[PDB]
Short mmCIF file of C-alpha atoms in Angstrom, two decimals:
data_model
loop_
_atom_site.label_atom_id
_atom_site.label_comp_id
_atom_site.label_asym_id
_atom_site.label_seq_id
_atom_site.Cartn_x
_atom_site.Cartn_y
_atom_site.Cartn_z
CA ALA G 693 5.21 -17.52 -14.91
CA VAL G 694 7.70 -14.42 -14.37
CA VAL G 695 6.83 -12.20 -11.43
CA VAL G 696 8.17 -8.55 -12.39
CA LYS G 697 8.57 -6.14 -9.64
CA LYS G 698 8.69 -2.42 -10.43
CA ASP G 699 9.92 0.33 -8.01
CA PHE G 700 8.18 3.60 -7.50
CA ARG G 701 8.59 6.74 -5.19
CA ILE G 702 5.71 9.13 -4.28
CA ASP G 703 7.00 12.62 -2.98
CA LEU G 704 4.95 13.94 -0.34
CA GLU G 705 4.88 17.45 1.34
CA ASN G 706 8.09 18.86 2.97
CA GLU G 707 10.69 15.82 2.44
CA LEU G 708 8.31 12.88 3.19
CA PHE G 709 8.07 10.11 0.65
CA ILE G 710 6.63 6.56 0.10
CA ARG G 711 8.74 4.14 -1.55
CA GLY G 712 6.98 1.07 -2.93
CA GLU G 713 6.66 -1.68 -5.50
CA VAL G 714 4.12 -2.78 -8.10
CA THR G 715 4.36 -6.79 -8.41
CA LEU G 716 2.61 -8.67 -11.04
CA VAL G 717 2.75 -11.29 -13.85
CA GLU G 718 2.51 -9.33 -17.16
CA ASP G 719 -0.04 -10.09 -19.68
CA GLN G 720 -2.68 -8.21 -21.78
CA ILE G 721 -5.48 -7.96 -19.22
CA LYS G 722 -6.29 -5.75 -16.43
CA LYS G 723 -5.84 -7.27 -13.27
CA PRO G 724 -7.43 -6.93 -9.75
CA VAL G 725 -5.46 -4.84 -7.43
CA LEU G 726 -4.45 -5.67 -3.99
CA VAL G 727 -2.90 -2.87 -1.88
CA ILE G 728 -0.81 -4.30 1.01
CA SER G 729 -0.11 -2.26 4.33
CA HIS G 730 2.58 -3.48 6.92
CA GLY G 731 2.17 -3.42 10.57
CA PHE G 732 3.61 -0.62 13.07
CA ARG G 733 7.14 -2.28 13.13
CA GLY G 734 7.22 -3.43 9.75
CA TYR G 735 8.33 -2.14 6.33
CA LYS G 736 7.73 -3.33 2.81
CA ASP G 737 10.95 -5.70 2.74
CA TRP G 738 10.34 -6.86 6.03
CA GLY G 739 9.63 -10.71 6.91
CA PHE G 740 7.09 -12.31 4.62
CA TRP G 741 6.02 -9.32 2.62
CA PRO G 742 8.31 -9.77 -0.47
CA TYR G 743 6.92 -13.39 -0.49
CA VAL G 744 3.34 -12.41 0.01
CA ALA G 745 3.51 -9.82 -2.70
CA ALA G 746 4.84 -12.40 -5.28
CA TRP G 747 2.49 -15.03 -4.08
CA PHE G 748 -0.68 -12.81 -5.01
CA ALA G 749 1.20 -11.69 -8.40
CA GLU G 750 1.62 -15.29 -9.45
CA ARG G 751 -2.31 -15.71 -8.88
CA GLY G 752 -3.11 -12.82 -11.19
CA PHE G 753 -3.15 -9.53 -8.97
CA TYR G 754 -1.69 -6.19 -9.55
CA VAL G 755 -0.05 -5.90 -6.19
CA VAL G 756 1.19 -2.65 -4.28
CA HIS G 757 3.18 -2.88 -1.24
CA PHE G 758 4.99 0.22 0.25
CA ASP G 759 6.85 1.52 3.04
CA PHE G 760 4.78 4.16 5.14
CA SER G 761 6.31 7.55 5.21
CA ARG G 762 7.46 7.25 8.76
CA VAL G 763 9.83 4.41 7.52
CA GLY G 764 11.32 6.76 5.03
CA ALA G 765 11.70 9.32 7.54
CA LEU G 766 13.49 7.15 9.90
CA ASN G 767 16.05 5.91 7.01
CA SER G 768 16.51 9.55 6.14
CA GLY G 769 17.76 10.30 9.86
CA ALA G 770 14.73 12.25 11.08
CA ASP G 771 14.99 12.73 14.87
CA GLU G 772 12.77 10.78 17.32
CA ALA G 773 9.92 13.47 17.57
CA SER G 774 9.69 13.79 13.72
CA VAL G 775 9.19 9.90 13.39
CA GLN G 776 6.75 9.74 16.22
CA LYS G 777 4.76 12.43 14.75
CA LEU G 778 4.58 10.41 11.49
CA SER G 779 3.61 7.12 13.52
CA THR G 780 -0.09 8.27 14.05
CA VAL G 781 -3.06 6.31 12.43
CA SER G 782 -4.15 9.61 10.93
CA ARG G 783 -0.67 9.55 9.09
CA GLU G 784 -1.26 6.08 7.81
CA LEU G 785 -4.59 7.15 6.46
CA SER G 786 -2.94 10.20 4.73
CA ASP G 787 0.01 7.75 3.40
CA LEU G 788 -2.88 5.31 2.19
CA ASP G 789 -4.79 8.31 0.43
CA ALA G 790 -1.51 9.08 -1.58
CA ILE G 791 -1.02 5.56 -2.56
CA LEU G 792 -4.89 4.95 -3.75
CA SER G 793 -4.66 8.46 -5.49
CA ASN G 794 -1.42 7.53 -7.46
CA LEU G 795 -2.79 4.08 -8.29
CA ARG G 796 -6.28 5.29 -9.26
CA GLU G 797 -4.84 8.18 -11.19
CA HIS G 798 -2.65 5.37 -13.29
CA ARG G 799 0.62 6.89 -12.05
CA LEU G 800 2.08 3.79 -10.74
CA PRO G 801 4.28 1.48 -12.91
CA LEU G 802 2.58 -0.77 -15.64
CA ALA G 803 -0.90 1.12 -14.65
CA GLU G 804 -2.54 -0.16 -17.69
CA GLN G 805 -2.41 -3.63 -16.32
CA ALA G 806 -4.36 -2.60 -13.06
CA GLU G 807 -8.13 -3.02 -12.80
CA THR G 808 -9.01 -0.23 -10.47
CA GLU G 809 -12.63 -0.92 -10.55
CA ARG G 810 -11.59 -4.08 -8.36
CA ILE G 811 -9.40 -2.76 -5.36
CA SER G 812 -8.90 -4.90 -2.06
CA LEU G 813 -6.83 -4.11 0.83
CA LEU G 814 -4.72 -6.29 3.10
CA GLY G 815 -3.55 -4.73 6.37
CA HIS G 816 -1.38 -6.38 9.28
CA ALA G 817 -1.65 -5.69 12.90
CA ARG G 818 -2.25 -2.12 13.45
CA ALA G 819 -2.75 -1.52 9.75
CA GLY G 820 -5.49 -3.99 9.95
CA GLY G 821 -7.46 -1.50 11.67
CA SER G 822 -6.38 1.53 9.60
CA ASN G 823 -7.27 -0.52 6.59
CA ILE G 824 -10.94 -1.12 7.99
CA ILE G 825 -11.21 2.49 8.46
CA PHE G 826 -9.96 3.47 4.90
CA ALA G 827 -12.03 0.80 3.47
CA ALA G 828 -15.11 2.03 5.32
CA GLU G 829 -14.52 5.58 4.22
CA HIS G 830 -13.91 4.98 0.41
CA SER G 831 -16.61 3.68 -1.78
CA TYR G 832 -14.01 2.17 -4.38
CA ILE G 833 -12.59 -0.28 -1.74
CA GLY G 834 -14.33 -3.46 -2.51
CA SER G 835 -13.07 -5.60 0.24
CA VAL G 836 -10.64 -5.48 2.98
CA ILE G 837 -8.69 -8.19 4.99
CA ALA G 838 -7.01 -7.69 8.31
CA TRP G 839 -4.25 -10.21 9.48
CA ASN G 840 -3.82 -9.99 13.49
CA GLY G 841 -5.35 -6.90 13.70
CA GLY G 842 -8.66 -5.06 13.28
CA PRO G 843 -9.87 -3.77 16.53
CA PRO G 844 -9.88 0.16 16.98
CA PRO G 845 -6.29 1.70 17.18
CA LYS G 846 -5.62 2.28 20.84
CA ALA G 847 -3.36 4.84 22.73
CA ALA G 848 -2.41 2.20 25.28
CA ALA G 849 -3.33 4.53 28.26
CA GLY G 850 -0.62 7.05 27.67
CA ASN G 851 1.64 5.98 24.79
CA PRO G 852 5.39 6.70 24.82
CA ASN G 853 4.20 8.86 21.85
CA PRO G 854 2.38 11.85 22.51
CA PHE G 855 1.11 12.52 19.16
CA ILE G 856 -0.45 8.89 19.07
CA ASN G 857 -2.25 9.96 22.42
CA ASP G 858 -3.61 13.15 20.96
CA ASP G 859 -4.56 11.37 17.66
CA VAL G 860 -6.61 8.61 19.40
CA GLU G 861 -8.20 11.17 21.67
CA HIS G 862 -9.29 13.32 18.67
CA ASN G 863 -10.59 10.34 16.77
CA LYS G 864 -12.55 8.16 18.96
CA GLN G 865 -15.58 7.83 16.74
CA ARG G 866 -13.66 8.20 13.51
CA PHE G 867 -11.26 5.09 14.34
CA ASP G 868 -14.07 3.00 15.89
CA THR G 869 -13.86 -0.10 13.80
CA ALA G 870 -16.49 -1.79 15.65
CA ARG G 871 -19.16 0.59 14.56
CA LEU G 872 -17.74 0.77 10.95
CA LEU G 873 -17.45 -3.04 10.66
CA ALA G 874 -21.07 -3.22 11.72
CA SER G 875 -22.19 -0.73 9.16
CA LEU G 876 -19.80 -1.64 6.02
CA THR G 877 -21.73 -3.46 3.39
CA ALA G 878 -18.67 -4.50 1.53
CA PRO G 879 -17.16 -7.99 2.60
CA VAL G 880 -14.43 -7.73 5.45
CA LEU G 881 -12.45 -10.81 6.65
CA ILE G 882 -10.22 -10.79 9.80
CA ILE G 883 -7.76 -13.49 10.34
CA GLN G 884 -6.18 -14.00 13.87
CA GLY G 885 -3.85 -16.51 15.06
CA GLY G 886 -4.39 -17.86 18.50
CA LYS G 887 -0.71 -17.37 19.85
CA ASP G 888 -0.92 -13.61 19.84
CA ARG G 889 -1.44 -11.19 22.88
CA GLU G 890 -4.51 -11.73 25.05
CA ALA G 891 -5.60 -8.09 24.85
CA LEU G 892 -5.77 -8.52 21.05
CA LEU G 893 -7.77 -11.70 21.34
CA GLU G 894 -10.22 -9.86 23.57
CA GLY G 895 -10.69 -7.04 21.15
CA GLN G 896 -11.17 -9.43 18.26
CA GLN G 897 -13.87 -11.26 20.26
CA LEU G 898 -15.48 -7.76 20.92
CA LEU G 899 -15.31 -6.86 17.33
CA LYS G 900 -16.83 -10.15 16.17
CA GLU G 901 -19.62 -9.67 18.66
CA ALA G 902 -20.20 -5.98 17.38
CA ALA G 903 -20.23 -7.17 13.58
CA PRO G 904 -21.57 -10.71 13.36
CA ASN G 905 -22.31 -9.85 9.68
CA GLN G 906 -18.45 -10.08 8.66
CA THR G 907 -16.20 -13.05 8.24
CA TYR G 908 -13.83 -14.32 10.96
CA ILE G 909 -11.14 -16.91 10.84
CA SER G 910 -9.29 -18.34 13.72
CA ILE G 911 -5.82 -20.00 13.21
CA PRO G 912 -5.38 -21.48 16.69
CA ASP G 913 -1.63 -22.29 16.78
CA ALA G 914 -0.55 -19.20 14.64
CA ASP G 915 1.68 -16.44 16.19
CA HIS G 916 1.47 -12.53 15.26
CA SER G 917 3.40 -13.20 12.09
CA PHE G 918 2.05 -16.58 11.11
CA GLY G 919 5.72 -17.57 11.82
CA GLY G 920 6.95 -15.35 9.10
CA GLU G 921 9.34 -13.26 10.83
CA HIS G 922 12.56 -11.92 9.34
CA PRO G 923 14.39 -13.05 7.18
CA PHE G 924 11.90 -15.22 5.25
CA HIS G 925 13.92 -18.33 4.23
CA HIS G 926 10.75 -20.48 3.58
CA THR G 927 6.89 -20.11 4.42
CA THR G 928 5.12 -21.71 6.94
CA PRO G 929 1.86 -23.63 7.15
CA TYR G 930 0.22 -20.95 8.97
CA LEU G 931 1.06 -18.33 6.43
CA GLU G 932 0.15 -20.66 3.65
CA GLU G 933 -3.44 -20.88 5.19
CA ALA G 934 -3.77 -17.22 5.81
CA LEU G 935 -2.83 -16.81 2.12
CA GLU G 936 -5.25 -19.49 0.59
CA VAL G 937 -8.08 -18.29 2.76
CA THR G 938 -7.52 -14.56 1.98
CA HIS G 939 -7.16 -15.59 -1.84
CA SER G 940 -10.47 -17.36 -1.64
CA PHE G 941 -12.10 -14.58 0.21
CA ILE G 942 -11.11 -11.89 -2.27
CA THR G 943 -11.90 -13.97 -5.38
CA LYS G 944 -15.27 -15.51 -3.96
CA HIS G 945 -16.31 -12.36 -2.26
CA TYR G 946 -17.38 -14.73 0.53
CA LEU G 947 -16.45 -18.04 2.28
#
Protein backbone atom coordinates (compact mmCIF):
# COMPACT_ATOMS: atom_id res chain seq x y z
CA ALA A 1 0.00 0.00 0.00
CA VAL A 2 3.05 2.23 0.45
CA VAL A 3 4.06 4.15 -2.67
CA VAL A 4 7.79 4.86 -2.76
CA LYS A 5 9.41 7.59 -4.84
CA LYS A 6 13.12 7.53 -5.73
CA ASP A 7 14.85 10.56 -7.24
CA PHE A 8 17.46 10.20 -9.95
CA ARG A 9 19.54 12.46 -12.17
CA ILE A 10 20.94 11.57 -15.60
CA ASP A 11 23.89 13.74 -16.59
CA LEU A 12 23.96 14.57 -20.30
CA GLU A 13 26.53 16.23 -22.56
CA ASN A 14 27.82 19.67 -21.63
CA GLU A 15 25.96 20.58 -18.42
CA LEU A 16 22.55 19.29 -19.43
CA PHE A 17 20.73 16.87 -17.15
CA ILE A 18 17.41 15.14 -16.57
CA ARG A 19 15.91 14.98 -13.09
CA GLY A 20 13.36 12.23 -12.62
CA GLU A 21 11.61 9.86 -10.26
CA VAL A 22 10.85 6.16 -10.11
CA THR A 23 7.48 5.59 -8.43
CA LEU A 24 6.32 2.13 -7.38
CA VAL A 25 4.91 -0.11 -4.66
CA GLU A 26 7.75 -2.43 -3.73
CA ASP A 27 7.30 -6.19 -3.88
CA GLN A 28 9.08 -9.29 -5.15
CA ILE A 29 7.98 -9.20 -8.79
CA LYS A 30 8.96 -7.33 -11.92
CA LYS A 31 6.42 -4.65 -12.78
CA PRO A 32 5.43 -3.34 -16.24
CA VAL A 33 7.00 0.06 -16.94
CA LEU A 34 5.18 3.28 -17.75
CA VAL A 35 7.40 6.17 -18.90
CA ILE A 36 5.61 9.54 -18.69
CA SER A 37 6.44 12.65 -20.79
CA HIS A 38 5.12 16.09 -19.82
CA GLY A 39 3.86 18.73 -22.27
CA PHE A 40 5.64 21.75 -23.65
CA ARG A 41 4.88 24.05 -20.72
CA GLY A 42 5.03 21.29 -18.07
CA TYR A 43 7.58 19.70 -15.74
CA LYS A 44 7.56 16.56 -13.63
CA ASP A 45 6.14 18.29 -10.52
CA TRP A 46 3.48 20.19 -12.48
CA GLY A 47 -0.25 19.83 -12.01
CA PHE A 48 -1.53 16.28 -12.11
CA TRP A 49 1.80 14.49 -12.73
CA PRO A 50 2.70 13.56 -9.09
CA TYR A 51 -0.82 12.19 -8.62
CA VAL A 52 -0.77 10.31 -11.94
CA ALA A 53 2.60 8.69 -11.23
CA ALA A 54 1.38 7.51 -7.82
CA TRP A 55 -1.93 6.38 -9.33
CA PHE A 56 -0.17 4.02 -11.73
CA ALA A 57 2.27 2.89 -9.01
CA GLU A 58 -0.67 1.86 -6.80
CA ARG A 59 -1.87 -0.30 -9.68
CA GLY A 60 1.37 -2.20 -9.99
CA PHE A 61 3.46 -0.20 -12.49
CA TYR A 62 7.09 0.82 -12.30
CA VAL A 63 6.59 4.47 -13.21
CA VAL A 64 9.24 6.85 -14.55
CA HIS A 65 8.54 10.57 -14.93
CA PHE A 66 11.08 13.30 -15.48
CA ASP A 67 11.95 16.89 -16.39
CA PHE A 68 12.96 17.26 -20.03
CA SER A 69 16.46 18.75 -20.13
CA ARG A 70 15.16 22.16 -21.25
CA VAL A 71 13.53 22.41 -17.79
CA GLY A 72 16.81 21.81 -15.97
CA ALA A 73 18.54 24.30 -18.25
CA LEU A 74 15.94 26.97 -17.50
CA ASN A 75 16.15 26.31 -13.75
CA SER A 76 19.96 26.49 -14.07
CA GLY A 77 19.82 30.02 -15.48
CA ALA A 78 20.40 29.23 -19.15
CA ASP A 79 19.70 32.17 -21.43
CA GLU A 80 16.67 32.36 -23.71
CA ALA A 81 18.54 31.13 -26.80
CA SER A 82 19.89 28.12 -24.89
CA VAL A 83 16.44 27.08 -23.60
CA GLN A 84 14.97 27.70 -27.06
CA LYS A 85 17.53 25.41 -28.72
CA LEU A 86 16.69 22.76 -26.09
CA SER A 87 12.93 23.07 -26.76
CA THR A 88 12.80 21.19 -30.09
CA VAL A 89 11.03 17.88 -30.70
CA SER A 90 14.42 16.42 -31.70
CA ARG A 91 15.69 17.31 -28.22
CA GLU A 92 12.65 15.61 -26.65
CA LEU A 93 13.50 12.44 -28.60
CA SER A 94 17.15 12.62 -27.46
CA ASP A 95 16.06 13.11 -23.84
CA LEU A 96 13.73 10.12 -24.15
CA ASP A 97 16.48 7.99 -25.60
CA ALA A 98 18.55 8.85 -22.51
CA ILE A 99 15.66 7.93 -20.17
CA LEU A 100 14.92 4.65 -21.98
CA SER A 101 18.61 3.76 -22.21
CA ASN A 102 19.15 4.25 -18.48
CA LEU A 103 15.97 2.28 -17.78
CA ARG A 104 16.85 -0.62 -20.09
CA GLU A 105 20.42 -0.80 -18.78
CA HIS A 106 18.93 -1.15 -15.26
CA ARG A 107 20.57 2.08 -14.05
CA LEU A 108 17.46 3.73 -12.55
CA PRO A 109 16.55 3.21 -8.87
CA LEU A 110 15.13 -0.19 -7.88
CA ALA A 111 15.78 -1.51 -11.39
CA GLU A 112 15.30 -5.12 -10.30
CA GLN A 113 11.58 -4.33 -9.94
CA ALA A 114 11.07 -3.18 -13.55
CA GLU A 115 9.98 -5.51 -16.32
CA THR A 116 11.72 -3.91 -19.26
CA GLU A 117 10.10 -6.43 -21.58
CA ARG A 118 6.83 -4.51 -21.00
CA ILE A 119 7.40 -0.78 -21.55
CA SER A 120 4.60 1.66 -22.38
CA LEU A 121 4.71 5.42 -22.97
CA LEU A 122 2.24 8.10 -21.88
CA GLY A 123 2.69 11.57 -23.38
CA HIS A 124 0.73 14.79 -22.82
CA ALA A 125 0.06 17.47 -25.47
CA ARG A 126 3.15 18.00 -27.65
CA ALA A 127 4.75 14.94 -26.03
CA GLY A 128 1.80 12.95 -27.31
CA GLY A 129 3.32 13.52 -30.74
CA SER A 130 6.92 12.93 -29.71
CA ASN A 131 5.94 9.75 -27.85
CA ILE A 132 4.22 8.37 -30.97
CA ILE A 133 7.39 9.09 -32.92
CA PHE A 134 9.54 7.44 -30.30
CA ALA A 135 7.20 4.46 -30.07
CA ALA A 136 7.11 3.97 -33.81
CA GLU A 137 10.91 4.07 -34.01
CA HIS A 138 11.66 1.62 -31.17
CA SER A 139 10.58 -2.03 -31.20
CA TYR A 140 10.74 -2.35 -27.42
CA ILE A 141 7.91 0.19 -26.86
CA GLY A 142 4.84 -2.04 -26.58
CA SER A 143 2.11 0.60 -26.53
CA VAL A 144 1.76 4.36 -26.35
CA ILE A 145 -1.01 6.65 -25.10
CA ALA A 146 -1.34 10.34 -26.01
CA TRP A 147 -3.39 12.75 -23.88
CA ASN A 148 -4.62 15.83 -25.78
CA GLY A 149 -1.92 15.48 -28.39
CA GLY A 150 -0.67 13.20 -31.10
CA PRO A 151 -0.97 15.14 -34.39
CA PRO A 152 2.37 16.00 -36.08
CA PRO A 153 4.51 18.58 -34.26
CA LYS A 154 4.13 21.99 -35.87
CA ALA A 155 6.25 25.12 -36.22
CA ALA A 156 3.08 27.21 -36.30
CA ALA A 157 4.12 29.07 -39.47
CA GLY A 158 7.14 30.91 -38.10
CA ASN A 159 7.43 30.16 -34.41
CA PRO A 160 9.01 32.66 -32.00
CA ASN A 161 11.59 29.86 -31.65
CA PRO A 162 13.80 29.64 -34.78
CA PHE A 163 15.26 26.30 -33.62
CA ILE A 164 11.77 24.79 -33.62
CA ASN A 165 11.23 26.16 -37.15
CA ASP A 166 14.44 24.57 -38.44
CA ASP A 167 13.62 21.32 -36.62
CA VAL A 168 10.16 21.03 -38.18
CA GLU A 169 11.58 22.01 -41.56
CA HIS A 170 14.21 19.26 -41.52
CA ASN A 171 11.97 16.53 -40.07
CA LYS A 172 8.78 16.75 -42.17
CA GLN A 173 8.69 13.02 -42.87
CA ARG A 174 10.23 11.84 -39.60
CA PHE A 175 7.64 13.70 -37.49
CA ASP A 176 4.61 12.73 -39.60
CA THR A 177 2.59 10.95 -36.92
CA ALA A 178 -0.28 10.29 -39.34
CA ARG A 179 1.93 8.02 -41.46
CA LEU A 180 3.55 6.56 -38.34
CA LEU A 181 0.23 5.73 -36.66
CA ALA A 182 -1.07 4.15 -39.83
CA SER A 183 1.85 1.72 -40.09
CA LEU A 184 2.56 1.10 -36.38
CA THR A 185 1.40 -2.41 -35.45
CA ALA A 186 1.53 -1.80 -31.70
CA PRO A 187 -1.58 -0.47 -29.90
CA VAL A 188 -1.89 3.32 -29.70
CA LEU A 189 -4.58 5.17 -27.74
CA ILE A 190 -5.35 8.86 -28.20
CA ILE A 191 -7.62 10.58 -25.66
CA GLN A 192 -8.78 14.10 -26.53
CA GLY A 193 -10.89 16.41 -24.38
CA GLY A 194 -13.52 18.31 -26.37
CA LYS A 195 -12.83 21.70 -24.72
CA ASP A 196 -9.41 22.10 -26.32
CA ARG A 197 -8.13 24.26 -29.17
CA GLU A 198 -10.09 23.99 -32.41
CA ALA A 199 -6.90 23.50 -34.46
CA LEU A 200 -5.98 20.56 -32.23
CA LEU A 201 -9.44 19.00 -32.64
CA GLU A 202 -9.09 19.28 -36.44
CA GLY A 203 -5.63 17.72 -36.25
CA GLN A 204 -7.01 14.84 -34.19
CA GLN A 205 -9.78 14.25 -36.73
CA LEU A 206 -7.19 14.11 -39.52
CA LEU A 207 -5.07 11.69 -37.50
CA LYS A 208 -8.03 9.40 -36.84
CA GLU A 209 -8.89 9.43 -40.53
CA ALA A 210 -5.31 8.53 -41.47
CA ALA A 211 -5.02 5.64 -38.99
CA PRO A 212 -8.48 4.12 -38.37
CA ASN A 213 -6.75 0.99 -36.97
CA GLN A 214 -5.78 2.66 -33.68
CA THR A 215 -7.98 3.56 -30.68
CA TYR A 216 -9.54 7.00 -30.17
CA ILE A 217 -11.47 8.22 -27.11
CA SER A 218 -13.33 11.55 -26.84
CA ILE A 219 -14.01 13.15 -23.47
CA PRO A 220 -16.33 15.91 -24.71
CA ASP A 221 -16.38 18.28 -21.70
CA ALA A 222 -12.70 17.92 -20.71
CA ASP A 223 -10.14 20.70 -21.19
CA HIS A 224 -6.47 20.49 -22.21
CA SER A 225 -5.45 19.36 -18.71
CA PHE A 226 -8.60 17.35 -17.88
CA GLY A 227 -9.05 20.05 -15.23
CA GLY A 228 -5.82 19.01 -13.49
CA GLU A 229 -4.01 22.35 -13.59
CA HIS A 230 -1.57 23.53 -10.91
CA PRO A 231 -1.54 22.97 -7.97
CA PHE A 232 -3.30 19.62 -7.68
CA HIS A 233 -5.54 19.79 -4.62
CA HIS A 234 -7.84 16.96 -5.80
CA THR A 235 -8.62 14.92 -8.88
CA THR A 236 -11.45 15.53 -11.36
CA PRO A 237 -13.98 13.24 -13.09
CA TYR A 238 -12.24 13.90 -16.41
CA LEU A 239 -8.80 12.97 -15.16
CA GLU A 240 -10.21 9.87 -13.42
CA GLU A 241 -11.85 8.84 -16.71
CA ALA A 242 -8.62 9.36 -18.67
CA LEU A 243 -6.67 7.35 -16.09
CA GLU A 244 -9.13 4.44 -16.01
CA VAL A 245 -9.31 4.28 -19.82
CA THR A 246 -5.51 4.45 -20.13
CA HIS A 247 -5.04 1.76 -17.48
CA SER A 248 -7.59 -0.50 -19.21
CA PHE A 249 -5.88 0.08 -22.56
CA ILE A 250 -2.40 -0.76 -21.29
CA THR A 251 -3.42 -3.88 -19.38
CA LYS A 252 -5.96 -5.27 -21.86
CA HIS A 253 -3.91 -4.22 -24.95
CA TYR A 254 -7.25 -3.12 -26.46
CA LEU A 255 -10.68 -1.75 -25.54
